[model samples]
Target: QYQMYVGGEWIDASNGQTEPVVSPINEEVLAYIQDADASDAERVLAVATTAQKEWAKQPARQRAEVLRKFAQLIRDNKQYLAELLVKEQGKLLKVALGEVEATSTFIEYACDWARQMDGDIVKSDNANEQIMIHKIPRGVVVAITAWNFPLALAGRKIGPALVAGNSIVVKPTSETPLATLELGYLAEQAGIPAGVLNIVTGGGRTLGNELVGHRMTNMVSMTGSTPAGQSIIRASANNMAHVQLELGGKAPFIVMEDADLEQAAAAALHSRFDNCGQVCTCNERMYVHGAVYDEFMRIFMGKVEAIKVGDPMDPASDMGPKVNANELAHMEELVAEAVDEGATVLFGGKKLEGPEFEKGFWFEPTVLTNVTQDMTIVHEESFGPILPVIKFDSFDEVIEYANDSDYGLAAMICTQNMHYINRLLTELESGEIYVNRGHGEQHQGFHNGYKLSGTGGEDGKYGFEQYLEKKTFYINY
Candidate 1:
């Protein structure tokens, strides 16, 4: 069983309510967690307000030491944490372990920034006067993390928020809050002060709404769907709090005629099928040049067919189950709906079932050809292992088709032509663009989106700045 960590104590919900944590791998109840309510949120806010003030007053070097210890602790217990993550999250064991490693790296990176973050000294117009700009911590941050990559996302936000001298209240998704609660325990062991960090678990509508709406929270950092981000933005309006939202994505994987068919096909497979295609940055749709369409499809379809889907614990399994039953049902409907609307299903279009798959939420990796721009899969985020491929006759036509979506999180192109490369660099309307490489965002790169994808960004030095405010000081001698 897992308990909510608030104000340095391990406790239950005030109302004594609890919710079960179910594993998508077997649809089994893993454990029960405290289901917090509005009252709990208020209590956390009161404690965080007091703790943040004292935390901010401490020297930057003092804070960096604590964060470094925390990172070392994470590294020491990574294997155990990864096992817990795989049980509830239904990801391959290796992938779960990789998330833990990444989480550790994020914290270590933030430790360097803790001491390196400095302000600038500006010139003053008046003689015998001096001016300096300082970056200070935001008072209290409420981090609302998504279910997918829960541990990594939580660490990503918590690292920067704490390193910048801001206290945080984390609300991990109800679907996978155990790993986050474990982190809270480790934070306490690393000598984090009472109320410096808190983890609450419950449904988003209840605890999440109360956190975002509360006036005590100085900033709201979230990673979830577009609609969820919009809802938080509306609620934050009550107090005019700063919000950093990393939302949905419909990444386009464009394969031009000049690209290597083999390399492009391999990149497409990893981008679309990794983590069961539940990642926001996964290439959701593909646009292949008409000249290479046939050859690319043959290679892509072959790779899709060879994928081995089974128990995530199996070393040979290429993919695991969907995170939950609802996601599986949604994936099934999207492919079926597309096929009905004149799209040809070249590969899978149904759910997996049998003795090995009956107890879990399983969907086969799907490949569809003859996809049109109007298809639902092309327009919306199908956060699953489904790839809908479309062929384009000209560069202009493909670029126009790729940029027409409401999402602008990420876009990719595989090309060697200088002219085509220049055009894509100048025309692609996305926050992150990739050329001849697989999908990934570096820790030093800015992970943000244009249009409806999200606002404010994460990672790099900019991410650390998100948890801080700018103040200019004038001194006269």
Candidate 2:
């Protein structure tokens, strides 16, 4: 059994509700959590409101020390957490371990930001007047994460929020909440004060609506579907809380004629299969230059076919199952619609059925060719191991098609030419652009989206800034 963390204590649901957690890997209940309700949220909110005052008074270095200790705790339990993640998220063991690494990195990077904190000083026109601009914490933060990378996403929000001297309430997606619940215990062990950090598990609509709409909520950080993000924006309006949302993405991957075909092919294959291509920044669509289309396809297909899919716990497995039956069905639905609209399935395109695949949501790494720009598969976020390939004749043409999507979360190119690189870097519509790699976003880089993908972002100094608000003071000498 798992319990929600409140006031540095492991407690059951005040409403007497418990939710059984089922693993997507085998579709069995592995653990259960005390499900949160309205009263639970109110209790957490009251604790957070009180805790923020004391926590905010701590110096930056003191807060940084606690996060450093928390990071160490995460590293100490890395393997155990990774295994738990695979059971719930159904990604490969290697990938889950990497997520554990990323989670630690997120906290460590926030620690680095503590020393770099600076404020603005300005001289006034009057001889006796001067102004000081300083940053301060926004109290009582509510962080909501997507199931694709539950622990990492929660850490992404928690690290910056806590380090910036704010009390936070983190809600992991109910489908994959076990690992995050464990994370709350780790936070408590790391010397976090009572009510400084809390984690709850339950249904989103009821729990999330109350938490986000709470009168004391000063900030909201969310990463989820586009519609869910829109709803969060609305819920935050009553309190006028600061909102940071990282929503859906349909990134476009382009390989020009002059690009490195071998490297680009391998990168695309791995990016689309990592975590079963459930990443928001995965290469959702591919645009190959017509001059090298056939050659690129040959190399890309070879790498795609080499992907070994099996149980996530198995060391040899390169890819694992999707999050659940619903995601697998969504993948099937996307491919079916694309084929109906004249796209050709050039590679794997069906649900895997066998003794090994039975009782799990399994689908092959699918590739679609003859896909037009307007096809549903190309525009919508596949969020699965499905890649659609489109051929373009010119550099200008590919740029236009890539930027046409409603989402602007991320985009990629595999070229070495400086002219193409410079132009695309400035003109690409997405918030993040991968020059020559797959999907390795470092903690130092800023990860954000431009349009409907989301507003505000995570990572680096800019992301740290999102957790704080600015205040100007005028003093007369």
Candidate 3:
């Protein structure tokens, strides 16, 4: 039911190829998308290149109005889109709706970006001379997104690029391509010019690399794993196109000695299980001080048990399946490896109970104790509902253990002590730090990663820069 849009036209792939979209809940093929190949990437880039120049010539306020109308359409169609998200992605209904809401917010905010868009005029040292720097469109941008957050993540890249006067080519993950393909229809309805934003659904390894390597392509923005980003970065080296990648996270949930057990338990659930634990910024490692380790475990285990994981369509479900069988297998394998490596299995380790859940890709919420800093599950990002708990004696030891990884994406310290909170905030190496709340990103805030977690920030004013280029004009009187 999904087709590729190119050069202001919706067309089938030259190869007549189609990729099956599997439902995360049932592992059934929900739909088919045109499998665009290398040739398709070239065609999309060509169209985007042409469209970018025309879109750039439009008045900024007019473009802003289009985006505002786009936001309104999203609000009007939220419930329908949220259902599609639940069917394609494995997020529970509530969580899927929350992502839908976030997408609307992003669209409105991106529309406002037009009003705030401005160029600066600087005075030259020479007499009667002026220099002006303008933010110009960056031509064609390819936004590659992951399955976990189909709409929001893709919108984060495409919305800003279009509003900033750039045309975009999106290569969404094959598993959750429906939500993105639907955007093509909405874009048309929102008065977006043809070829301004094109959606191509297929494998990231094939279409993604070709799209990024295209000479006409101006930038590449991807949200996925660290290893994937590294491969794309190498592939994009030939063009040296501006790269904005949001990669993996082995975020730490540090529960200090003085931390309240009740509060920490609630906080841990928010970070550990939200989005079915598939979030890039989700807390993967839990480091608790020895003084509160036992108490924290008792309280945390109770809270973890309270989570309701089942059918994604069911409104009462707290979590859902892990996208597909491969992810489900990986989730189980990681837990098994950790157990074989001397970590204690504290809670659910296998599939869920009851016949209603017998057929789905479901893994029981799992918790592991006696985890050391060296174990794979401890430092590696599982990206599932597996929580690992490690004991620490002091804040210094906890900080050292928490940061003993190549990832410096985000970290959190749950405590009431302001002095300790301030001290840890200064010491942590992550791009984002939280004192009481869970690891998260806000629109007004910025989100980036360090070390092997990829480069270039997003989510704020910096994100707009990814779609724009600096135009410095010299003036002489």
Candidate 4:
């Protein structure tokens, strides 16, 4: 059962209305959350108002120590939390398990910054005066995270916010709310206060808008698509709350001439289909150097064909369904649009047919060749297990093509040449660039985008900075 955690108490919807959380694989009603609205968000704000100052008053080292303990708690319960994420989110169990590890990893990284708070100590003008810059908690924050990497993303936001001495009301995706609820419950046992960490589960319209719009809400940080992040920013503006966004991506996975085809193809396979290609930084567009395009295509096609799709519960399954029917439909529509635009479906562009596969929203591992710059598939995010490879003649052409999208989240290159790597980093428009690695593999790279994809960034210590703000003070005697 799903419920809303307002202040310290978890309860049912005010109106007794429920929203069923459906599994992407087979449309199962995995669970339901209480329907909540702005009033509930206000209640959550009221909870934080008392707690935030108390939390902020704790010494930095003490706050960091508490987070260290929280990280250990996550490590202790990895398997239990991993299974819950898979059951509710329909991501493969391995991916869900990895997310558990990542949640702890991210929290640990944020905790490391605890002892490193160095503001500024500029020379004072007056003989008896001193000036100091300090990092301070920005009051109560509203953290609205997306469904793709629920636990990991939330940890990225909440871990830092707590460590920075800011109490937060976390609004998780209603579809994947259980793990978060369970996490909040555990945090309480781990010594978090009733209001220091609040969890509200329900529709964005009610909980999300209200939390952001509340006068006491000092900041609204979001991790999701561009349009959704933009909407949240607008809502937070009424209160002039600080806004942080991490949005969408149509990341470029480019393989150049003189590159190793087998290595490139293997990298592309992992990039395109890992986590069923639901990753925000998944290699959405593939630009192959014309010289090695044929070999890259053959190898890529062979690997993608062999990928096994089944229930997330199956250990042998390499791919799982999209998070829900809407996502499945979106994937289908994106593929159909590519095909309609005359891109050749080299293999696997249909719903998989099998007793086990049919019960779920399992689409085949799809590949499209002969994609064009203006095609819908090229321009949009197909957050599914589909690969669209476009051939390019030169580095100049590939760079131009890769930067063509409105999104500039990440870019990839698989070449032995260091000169090309340096050139791409300077010339490419992406926020992050990778060499000889797939999109999903980089844990420390800046995970973010330019344009409509998203604003701001996450991953590594840089992600920790989002939850913080700075203040300076001067005293003269």
Q: Per-prediction TM-score, please? A: 0.98, 0.98, 0.97, 0.96
The number of clashing residue pairs in each candidate reads: 0, 0, 0, 1
Stretches off by above 4 angstroms in model 1 are: none
**Model 2 steric clash pairs:** none
Q: Could you arrange the candidates by lDDT from highest to lowest?
A: 1, 2, 3, 4
Worst 10-residue lDDT window for candidate 3 reads 200-209
lDDT of 1 by residue, 1-477 (tens): 789888999888887899999999999998999988887888998898899899999888899899889888988899899988889999999999999988888877788887787889999898988899998997889999887899999889888988899999999999888888998779888998989888988768888899998999889999999999999999999988899999989999999999988999998999999999999899999999999988888888888989999988889999998989888899988988997899998888778878998899999888888889988889989999999999898899988988898999888889888798887667888888888987888788899898889989989988778888889989999
Q: How many clashes would you count in candidate 1?
A: 0
Q: At residue 126, give the lDDT of candidate 4.
A: 83
Q: Write the per-residue lDDT of candidate 3 for residues 1-477, one digit (tens) a residue.
A: 788867656888777789788787877778888886676778778888888889999987888788778767877888988999988887888877788878778867777788677889998888988899998888888899888898998778877888888888988888887877877777889888988888887556677788888788889999888889998889778777899998988999998888877887787788989887898888788888888877788888888888888888887788898888888899989988998899989898887768777667898888998878899998788999999988888878887886788998888888888887777657777887877778668876888878888888787888886788889988898
For all candidates in order, the CA lDDT equals 0.89, 0.88, 0.83, 0.81
Q: Candidate 2: misplaced stretches above 4 Å?
A: none
Writing each residue's lDDT as its tens digit, candidate 2 over 1-477 gives 999888888888877898787887778889988877777788888898899899989998999999899989999999999999999888888888989988998988888888677879998988999899998888889999998999899888888999998999998888898899898878878999989999887677888888988898999999999999988888888888888999989999899989899999888877777788999899999999999899999999988888888888999888888887888899999989998999999999998878887788899999999888999998889899999999999999999999898999888899889899899768888889988788768778899998899888878888899899889999998
- Candidate 3 colliding pairs: none
Worst 10 residues of 4 by lDDT: 439-448
Per-residue alpha-carbon lDDT of candidate 4 for residues 377-430, written as tens digits (9 for 90 to 100): 888888888888888888889888888888887778999988988887678888
RMSD of each: 1.1, 1.2, 1.4, 1.7
Displacement of residue 351 (Cα, Å) in model 3 is: 1.8
What global local distance difference test value does model 4 have?
Answer: 0.81
lDDT of model 2, residue 88 = 85
